[PDB]
Design a protein around this ligand. Structure first.
Ligand SMILES: *[C@@H]1O[C@H](CO)[C@@H](O[C@@H]2O[C@H](CO)[C@@H](O[C@@H]3O[C@H](CO[C@H]4O[C@H](CO)[C@@H](O)[C@H](O)[C@@H]4O)[C@@H](O)[C@H](O[C@H]4O[C@H](CO)[C@@H](O)[C@H](O)[C@@H]4O)[C@@H]3O)[C@H](O)[C@H]2NC(C)=O)[C@H](O)[C@H]1NC(C)=O
Ligand SMILES: *[C@@H]1O[C@H](CO)[C@@H](O[C@@H]2O[C@H](CO)[C@@H](O[C@@H]3O[C@H](CO)[C@@H](O)[C@H](O[C@H]4O[C@H](CO)[C@@H](O)[C@H](O)[C@@H]4O)[C@@H]3O)[C@H](O)[C@H]2NC(C)=O)[C@H](O)[C@H]1NC(C)=O
Ligand SMILES: *[C@@H]1O[C@H](CO)[C@@H](O[C@@H]2O[C@H](CO)[C@@H](O[C@@H]3O[C@H](CO)[C@@H](O)[C@H](O[C@H]4O[C@H](CO)[C@@H](O)[C@H](O)[C@@H]4O)[C@@H]3O)[C@H](O)[C@H]2NC(C)=O)[C@H](O)[C@H]1NC(C)=O
Ligand SMILES: *[C@@H]1O[C@H](CO)[C@@H](O[C@@H]2O[C@H](CO)[C@@H](O[C@@H]3O[C@H](CO)[C@@H](O)[C@H](O)[C@@H]3O)[C@H](O)[C@H]2NC(C)=O)[C@H](O)[C@H]1NC(C)=O
Ligand SMILES: *[C@@H]1O[C@H](CO)[C@@H](O[C@@H]2O[C@H](CO)[C@@H](O[C@@H]3O[C@H](CO)[C@@H](O)[C@H](O)[C@@H]3O)[C@H](O)[C@H]2NC(C)=O)[C@H](O)[C@H]1NC(C)=O
Ligand SMILES: *[C@@H]1O[C@H](CO)[C@@H](O[C@@H]2O[C@H](CO)[C@@H](O)[C@H](O)[C@H]2NC(C)=O)[C@H](O)[C@H]1NC(C)=O
Ligand SMILES: *[C@@H]1O[C@H](CO)[C@@H](O[C@@H]2O[C@H](CO)[C@@H](O)[C@H](O)[C@H]2NC(C)=O)[C@H](O)[C@H]1NC(C)=O
Ligand SMILES: *[C@@H]1O[C@H](CO)[C@@H](O[C@@H]2O[C@H](CO)[C@@H](O)[C@H](O)[C@H]2NC(C)=O)[C@H](O)[C@H]1NC(C)=O
Ligand SMILES: *[C@@H]1O[C@H](CO)[C@@H](O[C@@H]2O[C@H](CO)[C@@H](O)[C@H](O)[C@H]2NC(C)=O)[C@H](O)[C@H]1NC(C)=O
Ligand SMILES: *[C@@H]1O[C@H](CO)[C@@H](O[C@@H]2O[C@H](CO)[C@@H](O)[C@H](O)[C@H]2NC(C)=O)[C@H](O)[C@H]1NC(C)=O
Ligand SMILES: *[C@@H]1O[C@H](CO)[C@@H](O[C@@H]2O[C@H](CO)[C@@H](O)[C@H](O)[C@H]2NC(C)=O)[C@H](O)[C@H]1NC(C)=O
Ligand SMILES: *[C@@H]1O[C@H](CO)[C@@H](O[C@@H]2O[C@H](CO)[C@@H](O)[C@H](O)[C@H]2NC(C)=O)[C@H](O)[C@H]1NC(C)=O
Ligand SMILES: *[C@@H]1O[C@H](CO)[C@@H](O[C@@H]2O[C@H](CO)[C@@H](O)[C@H](O)[C@H]2NC(C)=O)[C@H](O)[C@H]1NC(C)=O
Ligand SMILES: *[C@@H]1O[C@H](CO)[C@@H](O[C@@H]2O[C@H](CO)[C@@H](O)[C@H](O)[C@H]2NC(C)=O)[C@H](O)[C@H]1NC(C)=O
Ligand SMILES: CCCCCC/C=C\CCCCCCCC(=O)O
Ligand SMILES: CCCCCC/C=C\CCCCCCCC(=O)O
Ligand SMILES: CCCCCC/C=C\CCCCCCCC(=O)O
Ligand SMILES: *[C@@H]1O[C@H](CO)[C@@H](O)[C@H](O)[C@H]1NC(C)=O
Ligand SMILES: *[C@@H]1O[C@H](CO)[C@@H](O)[C@H](O)[C@H]1NC(C)=O
Ligand SMILES: *[C@@H]1O[C@H](CO)[C@@H](O)[C@H](O)[C@H]1NC(C)=O
Ligand SMILES: *[C@@H]1O[C@H](CO)[C@@H](O)[C@H](O)[C@H]1NC(C)=O
Ligand SMILES: *[C@@H]1O[C@H](CO)[C@@H](O)[C@H](O)[C@H]1NC(C)=O
Ligand SMILES: *[C@@H]1O[C@H](CO)[C@@H](O)[C@H](O)[C@H]1NC(C)=O
Lengths: 996, 44, 54
C-alpha cells in the first residue's frame, strides 16, 4: 500500500514499499547498493488523497499548516513537499493549465503550466510544460513523459522529478496547488518531509529499506553500512559534547582597545534584464590615520572590526543620487578571498604582531573580497588588502572590556596561548620547571602553566573512545575509560583495566557469546573471565610403576580451512591509464616502461601460480568411479569376498553422505558441504555478454571496460573438487592396475586402527560406536555450516573473500581521483582545453594512475607470496594426513589421527580430521625390564621395541601393550634383548617363569 | 654543584647536573626524550 | 648537540664535535652498539670554480 502511518518522531515504518519514493540527486542515480545519505525522509505529516478526491492547498514552508494527516503530525519546519502519484495526462488541475503556483522571495509569482500546443518564448497561449513569470513563457521544460511517478519541490526552489533535479527556481515562500485524479488506484499521497541521515538500500534504482540513524544501535548500523550487525565489538564514542562555555588564556599585556569601522558605499543599477547590478564605483572608507583614509594600521593591544553599509542607485550613468529600492537594496559583506583567515573571525581572539588594512595591492600578503549581497545573488565589487605578521602582541577581541577566563572541571571550548580545542581543564600537583605549555606527539595540547603562580593545568578530551558489545542486534554492554553512563546503559562494574557498563543488574555463571582474550560477554550482558583450556595431559613414555593407558575411544572430527590459490587478474595498463584516447596513448609512449614493468610482474605472478597449482592436483579414474554417494550405497563394485557387507558405506555412510559428491548437486562432483560453503560464503565469467549492450553493465563488465580482466577460476574449482573426490574414493580402492574393485569402508578404518596400534581383540570389536560418533559429528558440522573449528574456518574463508573483493574495488575507485586536475575524465579535458593546455592536465592523471597501478601490483605480489606458503602447508597436509598416516605428533589435528577427508572450498580446501578421543584409562604396573636368575647366572632382559610397555597380569604372565591404545598381547622371547647387568627397578624372575 | 670548568673548546663536562639550565624554545617544551638540537651550549 | 631530557630537565649533553660523536648524534644515542655504521669519507670546503659554456 502507498499509505503508511508515521511513528513517533516521523519515521516511515519498516513495512513500507516505497513504490513512488526515490532518492533525490543532482547527478547520476545509484542502481544498486547501500548508501548513508541525508535525504528528506522525515515525514512530518502524510496527507492521503482518495480516488476522485480533490487536494487543494496553499502551503508556506515556514508554516507547518496541514489539513488532513493520517497519523501524528510533527511541529518542525518542512523542507520538501512530495507528490507521490502517477502524474499522467489524466490528472486535472483546478487552476486550469497551471499545475503549480509559486510565490518566491520578493513577491515574484511563477507558474508551472502545461498546454496542449507549443507556446513561443516571451508569449502567451502531447502536453508541453512551461515556466511562466508574468503570463509569458520564461523557460521551456519539455513534453510530459508518460512515466512520471513523483514530484518533489524543495523550499530552495529545486524540482525533482523521479529523483532527478531537472529545474531550479528562486527560493520559494509559498506553493499553491489544486489537483485531482481518478486513475491513481485507491490513494495517492502528499508528504511533507524534512532532511535526515539514513542508510538506504537500493535495488534497480528503487528504495527497498530505510534505516534511520536515530538510536545508538542504529548509529552503529549506519556506521557499519548494514542493518544486520554480527555479534562482536564495535568502536563508538562515549558521549556527545554541545553547549559548553568558553575559556581564553593569554599572556599579560596592557589593555587598550581600538574599534575599526569600515564604511562601504555601494552603487546599484538595473540591467536590461531587470537584474540588480552592483557598480565597481563603490567606495571604501577606513578610519582616518596620519591624514589618510586608505591605509590603517592597528596601534593598540586589542581591536575589533565592524562594517557599515550604505546603498545608492543609478540610471546607467553612474550618478548615484537616489535611495536603493526593494529590488536594488544590497548589503555590504566581506569575504575571505585569498586570506588564510576570515574577516568575521578577526574578533575571535586572533593574534598578530602587525595588522594593516589598505586599499592598494602593493606589499599585501592577501586580500579580502568586498561584495554586495542582494535578495538573489552576491557580487564582488572591491578588494581590501591585508598586511599581517604572525605573533601575539595584538589580539582581536569581540568587544571592549582581564581577558583570562578559565572554566575548570567541566567541558569547555578553550583558546590557551593560541591553541584551541574542546576539553576538560584540571589543576595538577605536578611541578614542571620549564616551558609554558606542552603538546603530544600528534600536536594536541596536554597541559599549560599559569604565569602568575606556576601552577600546571592538564587538559583531557571531553569524550573518549569506547567499545560496544553487540549480541543479537542489541547493545548489551560497553567498555569505557570514564565512569559515566553511555549508550543507554546504567548499571556498571569495575575492572582492573576499564569500566564495564551493562544491562545486567550490577550492585556469574553464563555461557559467553562474544569473547576476546580473557574477556567474555554473555547474552544477558554479564562479564565473565575466560581461562586457558584444561586437558588431562599427555601420555608419557614411562614403563616404571603405575601407568595409565587410554582404553575407551570415541571419534572427534575437526575442521580446518587452508587457502590454495588466489584470484588472478590481468591489467591492460594502457586502457587503465588512458580510456582509449589516442592522444593519451601518445603521451604514455614516454612512460611505456612503467606499463611494461606492471604487465610483466602481473603476468609472471599468474604464470608461477598456475605452474604451482598444476603440479599439485591429480585424479585417478578408478578412484573417481567409486567417489559418489550412489557408489558407496551399492554393492556393485564390492569384491565378492565381502558378501556380508551390504554396501561400501556401511555404518559410516550416514556421515559420508555429506562429504562425498552426490547427483543432487548444482554442479558435477559437488557435495552437500561444498554447496553450503559456496552458497553461504559467496559469478559469471563470460565476457561475451559485456559487449552485447542489452542492458546496463554490471560491476564486472564496468571493470572490464576499465581494462581489468579477472582470469577464469571455475576450472580451478572443478579441478579441486575432482581432486578431493578422487582422494576420498582412493581409500576404498582394493587394487590399482585393474577395474574399480572396492573394499568396505570399515576394512579401511580397521587398517588405520591397526596402524595406530596392533589390534589384539579380533572377536570383540566395536566399530559401531566409532561410526555413530563420526555420523553425529558430521551431522553437527553440516548443521553448523548451513564447534570452534567450524567458526574459525568460516571466518577465514569470509576474510579471504572480502580481501579479494576490496583489492579490486580500491583500484577501480582510484579512477575518479582528479590528481590536482580540472577533471578526472580525459575526454572532458580534451573537449575543453587546447592540446598544449590539455597535455599538462593529462600528465597528472597519467602519473597518478601509474602510481595506483604500482601499489596494486605490490599488494598482489605480497598476497601471492603468502598464499604460496599456505599452499605449501596445504600440500603437506594432503600428503601426510589424507594420503597416509603421519608419524608427526599433533600434525593432523588434536588427538590420535585416524584418517582425514578433504573438500573444495572458495580459493582452497577444508579438511575433516578424524581423531580418537579417549574416555577412560587402564592402570597397569609397568616394569622397565626383567632380571632373570638361573642360579649363578643373572642377566637382564629389556623390551626390544621401545614403544611397548611391559606389565604383568593376574596369572603372573608378562604382557606387552602400546601406549597409544590399550591392546595387550602375550610377550614372547623374540620381544626381548638380553643384557649383562640389571637395574634396581627391574622385576626379579626365575628361568621357569620367563615368557616363551 | 652549579660551577663547572669548561674543557678545551668550551664544552660542558659530562659530570654536570644542569640544575638551572633549560632548552630554549619558541613553542612547546619537550617533556622527555633525546633530541639533536642547535642550542647555546658552547660555554666560552 | 644530542640532549637527553627527563621531566623538562636536561640530563646529558653530547656535543657532535668528533667523528665518534658524529655517529652518536646520527644514531640519537650516546651508547653505540658494536657494528657497522654508514659515514662520509670527508668534508669538502673552499674549492675552486669551473665554468664550461658553448
Ligand atoms: C585436545 O583434545 C582433548 C581431548 O582429546 C581435550 O581434552 C579434554 O578437554 C576437556 C575440556 O577441558 C576436558 O573436560 C573436562 O573434564 C573435567 C574433569 O571431569 C571430571 O568429571 C568427569 C565426570 O564425568 C570425570 O569423568 C572426569 O574424570 C573428572 O573427574 C570436567 O570437570 C570438565 O567439565 C566441564 O563442564 C562442567 C559443566 O559445565 C564445568 O563445571 C567444568 O568447569 C568444565 O567446563 C570437562 O568435562 C577433558 O577431560 C579433556 N580430555 C582429555 C582426554 O584430556 C583438549 O582440551 C584438547 N586441546 C585443545 C587445545 O583443544
Ligand atoms: C543539489 O544542489 C543544490 C544546490 O545547487 C542543493 O540545494 C541546497 O540545499 C541545502 C539543504 O539541503 C541548502 O542548505 C541550507 O542553507 C541555508 C542557508 O541559506 C541554511 O539556512 C539551511 O540550514 C538550516 O536548515 C536545515 C533545514 O531546516 C536544517 O537541517 C539545518 O540545521 C539549518 O537549520 C540549509 O543548510 C542549500 O542552501 C541549498 N543550496 C542552494 C539553494 O544553492 C541541493 O541539496 C542538492 N540536492 C541534492 C544533493 O540532492
Ligand atoms: C625563535 O625565533 C627567533 C626568530 O623569531 C629566532 O631568532 C633567530 O636566531 C638566529 C640565530 O639562532 C638568527 O640567525 C642569524 O641570522 C643573522 C642574520 O641577521 C646571521 O648573521 C647569523 O649568522 C651568523 O652568526 C651565527 C652566530 O654567531 C653563526 O653561527 C653563523 O655561522 C653566522 O656567522 C645568524 O644565523 C636569526 O636572525 C634570528 N631571527 C630573528 C631575529 O628574526 C630564534 O632562534 C628562535 N629560538 C629558538 C628556535 O629557540
Ligand atoms: C577430464 O577427466 C575426467 C576424469 O577422467 C573426465 O571425466 C569423465 O567424464 C566423462 C564425460 O562426462 C564420463 O563418461 C560419461 O559419463 C556419463 C555419466 O552419465 C555416461 O552417460 C557416459 O556413458 C560416460 O561414461 C566419465 O565417467 C568421467 N570419468 C570419471 C573417471 O569420472 C572428463 O571428461 C575429462 N574431461 C575432458 C574434457 O576430457
Ligand atoms: C550432534 O551430536 C550430538 C551428540 O550427542 C547428537 O545427539 C545425539 O543424537 C542421537 C541420535 O538422535 C541420540 O541417540 C538417541 O538417544 C536417545 C536417548 O538415549 C535414544 O532414546 C534414541 O533411541 C537414540 O539412541 C543421542 O542421545 C544424542 N545425544 C545427546 C547427548 O543428545 C546430535 O544428534 C547431533 N546432531 C546432528 C544434527 O546430527
Ligand atoms: C480547486 O478547483 C476546483 C475545481 O477543480 C474548484 O471548484 C470550483 O469552484 C468554482 C468557484 O466556486 C465553481 O464555480 C466550480 O463549479 C467548482 N468546481 C467543482 C468541480 O466543484 C475549487 O474551488 C478549487 N479550490 C480552491 C481554489 O481552493
Ligand atoms: C506572495 O507573498 C507575498 C509576500 O508574503 C504576499 O505579499 C504580502 O501580502 C500581504 C497580504 O496581507 C501583505 O500584508 C504583505 O505586506 C505583502 N508583502 C509584501 C512584501 O508586499 C503576496 O500577497 C503573495 N501573493 C499571493 C498569495 O498570491
Ligand atoms: C501508479 O500506477 C502503478 C501501475 O502503473 C500502480 O502500481 C500497481 O498497483 C496495483 C494495485 O495495487 C498492483 O496490482 C500492481 O502490481 C502495481 N504495479 C507495479 C507495482 O508495478 C501504482 O499504485 C500507481 N500509483 C498511485 C500513487 O496511484
Ligand atoms: C565614490 O566616490 C566617488 C568620488 O567622490 C564618486 O564619484 C563622484 O560622484 C559625484 C556625485 O555624482 C560626481 O559629481 C563626481 O564627478 C564623481 N567623481 C568622479 C571622479 O567620478 C562616486 O559617486 C562614489 N560612489 C558611490 C557613492 O557609490
Ligand atoms: C593564575 O594564578 C593567579 C594567582 O593565583 C590567579 O589569580 C587569582 O584569581 C583569584 C580568582 O579571581 C583571586 O581570588 C586571586 O586573588 C588571584 N590571585 C592573584 C591575582 O595573585 C589567576 O586567576 C590564575 N589564572 C588563571 C587563568 O587561572
Ligand atoms: C599401583 O596401584 C595399586 C592399586 O591399583 C597398588 O596396589 C595396592 O597397594 C596398596 C597400598 O600398599 C595395598 O593396600 C593394596 O593391597 C594393593 N593392591 C594390590 C591389588 O596389590 C600398588 O601398590 C601401586 N603400585 C605402585 C608401584 O605404586
Ligand atoms: C541408499 O539406498 C537405500 C535403498 O534404496 C535408500 O533407502 C531408501 O530410501 C528411500 C527414500 O530415498 C525410501 O523410500 C526407501 O524405503 C528406503 N529403502 C530402504 C531403507 O530399504 C537410502 O536412502 C540410500 N541412502 C543414501 C542415498 O544415503
Ligand atoms: C570402558 O568401557 C567399558 C564398556 O562400558 C567399561 O566396562 C563396563 O563398565 C561398566 C561401568 O562400570 C560396568 O557396569 C560394566 O560391567 C563394564 N563391562 C565390562 C564388560 O567390563 C569399562 O569399565 C571402561 N573402561 C574403564 C577403564 O573405565
Ligand atoms: C631383586 O633381587 C635383588 C637381589 O636380591 C634385590 O637387590 C637387593 O636389594 C636389597 C634392598 O631391597 C639390598 O639390601 C640387597 O643388598 C640387594 N641385593 C643385591 C644382590 O644387590 C632387589 O631389590 C630385588 N628387586 C626388587 C624389585 O624386588
Ligand atoms: C577503554 C578501552 C577498553 C578496551 C577493552 C577491549 C575489549 C574489547 C575489544 C575487542 C576487539 C578485538 C577485535 C574483535 C572484534 C569483534 O569481535 O568484532
Ligand atoms: C627581568 C626581570 C624578570 C622578568 C619578568 C618577566 C615577567 C613575567 C614572567 C613571565 C614568565 C613566567 C614563566 C613561569 C616560570 C615558572 O613558573 O616555571
Ligand atoms: C666502500 C663500501 C665497502 C663495503 C664493505 C661492506 C662491509 C660492511 C657492511 C656491513 C653491513 C651489514 C649490516 C650489519 C651492520 C651492523 O652490524 O651494525
Ligand atoms: C488544444 O486544445 C484546444 C481546446 O480544445 C484546441 O482549440 C486546440 O486546437 C488544441 N491544440 C492542438 C495542437 O491540438
Ligand atoms: C504582467 O502583464 C500584465 C498584463 O499585460 C501587465 O499589466 C503587467 O504590467 C505585467 N507585469 C510586469 C511586471 O511586466
Ligand atoms: C558556564 O559557566 C556558568 C557559570 O559561569 C555555569 O552556570 C554554566 O552552567 C556553565 N555552562 C556550561 C557548563 O555549559
Ligand atoms: C565604530 O562603530 C561602532 C559600532 O560598531 C560605534 O559604536 C563607534 O562609535 C564607531 N567608532 C567611530 C565611528 O570612531
Ligand atoms: C537488582 O537486584 C537488586 C537486589 O540485588 C534489586 O533490589 C534491584 O531492584 C534490581 N534492579 C533492577 C532489577 O533493575
Ligand atoms: C685553485 O686553483 C689555484 C690555481 O689557479 C690553486 O693555487 C689553488 O690551490 C686552487 N684552490 C683550491 C684547489 O681550493
Amino acid at each position: 500500500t502507498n499509505v503508511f502511518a508515521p511513528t513517533v518522531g516521523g519515521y516511515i515504518p519498516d513495512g513500507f514499499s516505497f513504490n513512488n519514493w526515490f532518492l533525490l540527486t543532482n547527478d547520476s542515480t545509484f542502481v544498486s547498493g547501500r548508501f548513508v545519505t541525508n535525504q528528506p525522509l522525515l515525514v512530518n505529516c502524510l496527507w492521503p488523497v482518495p480516488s476522485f478526491g480533490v487536494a487543494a492547498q496553499e502551503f508556506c514552508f515556514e508554516g507547518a499548516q496541514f489539513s488532513q494527516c493520517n497519523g501524528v503530525s510533527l511541529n518542525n519546519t518542512v523542507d520538501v513537499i512530495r507528490f507521490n502519484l502517477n502524474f499522467t495526462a489524466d490528472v486535472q488541475s483546478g487552476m486550469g493549465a497551471t499545475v503549480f503556483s509559486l510565490n518566491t522571495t520578493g513577491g515574484v509569482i511563477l507558474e508551472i503550466s502545461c498546454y496542449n500546443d507549443t507556446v513561443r518564448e516571451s508569449s502567451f497561449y502531447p502536453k508541453y510544460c512551461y515556466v511562466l513569470y508574468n503570463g509569458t513563457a520564461l523557460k521551456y521544460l519539455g513534453t510530459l513523459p508518460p512515466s512520471v511517478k513523483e514530484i518533489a519541490i524543495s523550499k530552495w526552489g529545486h524540482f525533482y522529478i523521479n529523483g532527478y533535479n531537472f529545474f531550479s527556481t528562486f527560493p520559494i515562500d509559498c506553493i499553491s496547488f489544486n489537483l485531482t485524479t481518478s486513475t491513481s488506484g485507491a490513494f495517492w499521497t502528499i508528504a511533507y518531509t524534512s532532511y535526515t541521515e539514513a542508510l538506504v538500500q537500493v535495488e534497480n534504482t528503487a528504495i527497498k529499506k530505510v534505516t534511520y540513524c536515530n538510536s545508538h544501535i542504529n548509529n552503529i548500523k549506519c556506521s557499519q553500512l548494514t542493518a544486520n550487525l554480527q555479534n562482536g565489538f564495535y568502536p563508538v564514542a562515549s558521549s556527545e559534547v554541545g553547549l559548553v562555555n568558553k575559556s581564553v588564556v593569554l599572556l599579560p599585556s596592557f589593555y587598550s582597545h581600538t574599534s575599526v569601522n569600515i564604511t562601504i558605499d555601494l552603487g546599484m543599477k538595473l540591467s536590461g534584464y531587470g537584474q540588480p547590478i552592483a557598480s565597481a564605483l563603490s567606495n571604501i572608507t577606513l578610519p582616518m590615520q596620519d591624514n589618510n583614509t586608505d591605509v590603517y594600521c592597528i596601534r593598540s593591544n586589542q581591536f575589533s572590526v565592524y562594517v557599515h553599509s550604505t546603498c545608492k542607485s543609478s540610471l546607467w550613468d553612474n550618478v548615484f543620487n537616489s535611495d536603493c529600492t526593494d529590488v536594488l537594496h544590497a548589503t555590504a559583506v566581506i569575504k575571505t578571498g585569498t586570506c588564510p583567515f576570515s574577516f568575521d573571525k578577526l574578533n575571535n581572539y586572533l593574534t598578530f604582531n602587525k595588522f594593516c588594512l589598505s586599499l592598494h595591492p602593493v606589499g599585501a600578503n592577501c586580500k579580502f573580497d568586498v561584495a554586495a549581497r542582494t535578495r538573489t545573488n552576491e557580487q564582488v565589487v572591491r578588494s581590501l588588502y591585508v598586511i599581517y605578521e604572525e605573533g601575539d602582541n595584538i589580539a582581536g577581541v569581540p568587544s571592549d572590556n582581564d581577558l583570562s577566563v578559565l572554566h575548570l572541571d567541566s567541558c569547555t571550548d578553550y583558546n590557551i596561548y593560541g591553541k584551541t580545542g574542546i576539553g576538560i581543564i584540571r589543576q595538577t600537583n605536578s611541578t614542571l620547571l620549564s616551558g609554558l605549555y606542552y603538546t603530544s606527539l600528534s600536536g594536541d595540547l596536554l597541559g599549560f602553566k599559569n604565569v602568575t603562580d606556576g601552577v600546571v593545568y592538564s587538559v583531557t578530551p571531553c569524550d573518549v573512545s569506547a567499545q560496544a558489545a553487540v549480541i543479537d542486534g542489541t547493545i548489551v554492554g560497553a567498555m569505557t575509560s570514564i565512569n559515566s553512563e553511555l549508550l543507554g546503559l546504567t548499571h556498571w562494574t569495575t575492572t582492573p583495566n576499564f569500566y564495564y557498563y551493562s544491562i545486567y543488574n550490577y550492585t556469574v555463571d553464563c555461557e559467553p557469546i562474544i569473547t576476546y582474550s580473557n574477556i567474555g560477554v554473555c547474552k544477558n550482558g554479564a562479564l565473565v573471565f575466560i581461562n586457558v583450556t584444561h586437558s588431562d595431559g599427555d601420555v608419557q613414555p614411562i614403563s616404571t610403576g603405575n601407568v595409565t593407558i587410554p582404553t575407551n575411544f570415541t571419534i572427534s572430527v575437526q575442521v580446518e580451512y587452508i587457502q590454495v590459490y588466489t584470484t588472478p587478474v590481468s591489467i591492460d595498463c594502457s586502457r587503465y591509464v588512458c580510456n582509449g584516447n589516442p592522444r593519451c596513448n601518445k603521451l604514455l609512449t614516454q612512460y611505456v616502461s612503467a606499463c611494461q614493468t606492471i604487465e610483466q610482474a602481473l603476468a609472471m605472478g599468474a604464470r608461477l601460480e598456475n605452474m604451482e597449482v598444476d603440479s599439485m592436483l591429480f585424479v585417478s579414474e578408478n578412484a573417481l568411479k567409486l567417489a559418489s554417494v550412489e557408489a558407496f550405497n551399492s554393492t556393485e563394485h564390492l569384491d565378492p569376498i565381502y558378501k556380508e557387507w551390504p554396501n561400501i558405506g556401511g555404518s559410516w555412510l550416514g556421515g559420508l553422505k555429506d562429504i562425498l559428491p552426490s547427483h543432487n548437486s548444482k554442479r558435477k562432483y559437488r557435495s552437500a558441504i561444498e554447496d553450503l560453503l559456496f552458497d553461504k560464503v559467496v559469478v559469471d565469467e563470460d565476457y561475451k555478454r559485456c559487449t552485447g549492450g542489452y542492458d546496463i553493465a554490471d560491476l564486472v563488465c564496468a571493470q572490464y571496460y576499465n581494462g581489468i580482466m579477472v582470469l577464469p577460476g571455475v576450472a580451478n574449482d572443478d579441478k579441486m573438487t575432482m581432486y578431493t573426490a578422487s582422494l576420498a574414493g582412493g581409500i576404498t580402492l582394493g587394487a590399482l592396475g585393474g577395474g574399480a574393485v572396492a573394499i568396505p569402508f570399515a576394512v579401511a578404518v580397521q587398517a588405520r586402527l591397526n596402524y595406530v596400534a596392533l589390534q589384539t581383540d579380533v572377536l570383540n570389536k566395536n566399530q559401531q560406536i566409532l561410526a555413530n560418533a563420526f555420523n553425529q559429528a558430521i551431522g553437527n558440522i553440516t548443521q553448523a555450516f548451513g564447534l570452534a573449528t567450524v567458526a574459525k574456518a568460516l571466518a577465514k574463508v569470509q576474510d579471504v573473500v572480502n580481501t579479494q573483493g576490496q583489492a579490486l574495488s580500491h583500484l577501480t575507485v582510484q579512477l575518479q581521483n582528479n590528481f590536482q586536475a580540472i577533471s578526472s575524465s580525459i575526454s572532458d579535458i580534451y573537449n575543453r582545453l587546447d592540446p598544449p593546455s590539455a597535455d599538462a592536465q593529462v600528465d597528472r592523471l597519467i602519473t597518478g594512475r601509474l602510481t595506483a597501478l604500482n601499489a596494486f601490483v605490490s599488494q598482489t605480489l605480497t598476497r601471492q607470496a603468502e598464499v604460496r606458503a599456505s599452499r605449501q602447508l596445504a600440500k603437506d597436509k594432503v600428503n601426510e594426513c589424507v594420503r597416509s598416516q603421519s608419524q608427526r605428533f599433533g600434525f593432523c589435528g588434536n588427538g590420535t589421527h585416524l584418517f582425514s577427508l578433504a573438500n573444495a572450498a572458495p580459493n582452497g580446501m577444508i579438511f575433516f580430521h578424524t581423531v580418537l578421543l579417549p574416555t577412560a584409562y587402564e592402570t597397569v604396573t609397568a616394569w622397565s625390564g626383567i632380571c632373570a636368575s638361573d642360579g649363578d647366572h643373572t642377566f637382564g632382559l629389556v623390551v626390544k621395541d621401545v614403544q611397548l610397555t611391559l606389565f604383568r597380569n593376574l596369572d603372573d604372565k608378562f604382557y606387552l601393550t602400546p601406549r597409544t591404545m590399550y591392546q595387550p598381547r602375550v610377550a614372547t622371547i623374540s620381544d626381548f634383548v638380553q643384557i649383562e647387568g640389571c637395574d634396581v627397578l627391574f622385576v626379579n624372575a626365575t628361568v621357569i617363569e620367563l615368557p616363551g
